[PDB]
Swiss-Prot record, chain A:
Interacts with neddylated CUL2, ubiquitinated HIF1A, and VCP/p97. Residues 1-75 form the UBX domain. It is found in: Nucleus. Ubiquitin-binding adapter that links a subset of NEDD8-associated cullin ring ligases (CRLs) to the segregase VCP/p97, to regulate turnover of their ubiquitination substrates. This is UBX domain-containing protein 7. The UIM (ubiquitin-interacting motif) is required to engage the NEDD8 modification on cullins.
UniProtKB/Swiss-Prot annotation, chain B:
It comes from the Eukaryota. This is Transitional endoplasmic reticulum ATPase. It comes from Homo sapiens. Necessary for the fragmentation of Golgi stacks during mitosis and for their reassembly after mitosis. Involved in the formation of the transitional endoplasmic reticulum (tER). The transfer of membranes from the endoplasmic reticulum to the Golgi apparatus occurs via 50-70 nm transition vesicles which derive from part-rough, part-smooth transitional elements of the endoplasmic reticulum (tER). Vesicle budding from the tER is an ATP-dependent process. One of its GO terms (cellular component) is ciliary basal body. The chain holds residues 23 to 191 of 806 of the full protein. Phosphorylated by tyrosine kinases in response to T-cell antigen receptor activation. Phosphorylated in mitotic cells. ISGylated. Changing R134S: In IBMPFD1; impaired autophagic function.
Amino acid sequence: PKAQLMLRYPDGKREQITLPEQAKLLALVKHVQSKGYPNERFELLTNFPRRKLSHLDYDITMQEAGLCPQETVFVQERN
Amino acid sequence: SPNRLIVDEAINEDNSVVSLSQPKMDELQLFRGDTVLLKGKKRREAVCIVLSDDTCSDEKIRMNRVVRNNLRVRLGDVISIQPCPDVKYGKRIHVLPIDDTVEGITGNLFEVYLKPYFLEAYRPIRKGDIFLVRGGMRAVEFKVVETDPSPYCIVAPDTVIHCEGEPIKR
């Protein structure tokens, strides 16, 4: 089973990916880093309600993180 | 006409959000947080975020007063909705406060109203929109007089927000 993620990067480009629901939140973070947005400088947000995913334990599953079955995730430079 | 829908009142009101039943969202292949383009009367359009609502009848769409006004529609009127995935991050938007909502207003409109309003919420906004922001001593309305790209965009953290000079009417 797979989670569908609509990623919005800070230049406004979009990417739709899938990840296994059972995969670590860390897999998402690493994916965003391979796209040129490293964890040390960028964080992950959802809207409605606003949740800061980069405050979570990354060893948590995508399902536990609340990103299944689909979620829009914003990539944003840290303050 | 699966994407023409009856306007219904909002629950959990927000200027950037409209709600559909999950089946109608499947029917139209809309996902959570997708941007969508809405068409109302007098060639008025609006761009919003769509969320699912187990409370909403299939053939209806929930939207608040701000969005209904921007579409010139009333409860019970019909609008159309379509996917709108290519809306860009804004370089810059220009907004101006409505004169009769800031008559006594002292203070910085950007710091008290606009900055928290737009903060990290990725609001879609369109030229001509009027929106109501709470805060301060009383709520203020602003009109979008220009966006770049035109005529709509997403107000991102890097989107420059200009709040010019004299308030305007209508």
